[PDB]
Design a protein around this motif. Sequence first.
Motif: not given
Length: 134
Positions: A43-51
Amino acid sequence: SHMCDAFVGTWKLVSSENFDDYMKEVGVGFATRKVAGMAKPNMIISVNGDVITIKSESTFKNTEISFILGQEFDEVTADDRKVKSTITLDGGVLVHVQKWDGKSTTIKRKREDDKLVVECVMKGVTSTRVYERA
Ligand SMILES: c1ccc2c(c1)c1c(n2CCc2nnn[nH]2)CCCCCC1
């Protein structure tokens, strides 16, 4: 410095409990249950701004969702359900609700110690799936 920092990363499945029964409750058929139950996803979780992006990579399927908290989206699940999903943060827990065919299931993701614990619930049936950093 934000809303999901402690979720971000690459995680590997290390234990599962009751997943077959959860999948039965959901409506998944025999052959998909057997092959999906064998999977050991990353499971790979990332965040870019609000996304927020959540990928699941396994021999069974590779899936990817991107979303904004509170904003509904359409999702094709690994078991091929066409669902309408909404993911929110509730007291530091990511809560993912899927609606299809007048049915609903909720997937909660929480950080506990060095683990990421996924709780899948359909009606009275829970499956707990425990991930470690990869
Ligand atoms: C392998 C890994 C992950 C999977 C699956 C299979 C399936 C789902 N999830 C996402 C929820 C999740 N994340 N970790 N375990 N479960 C959809 C709901 C259950 C039906 C079977 C297919």
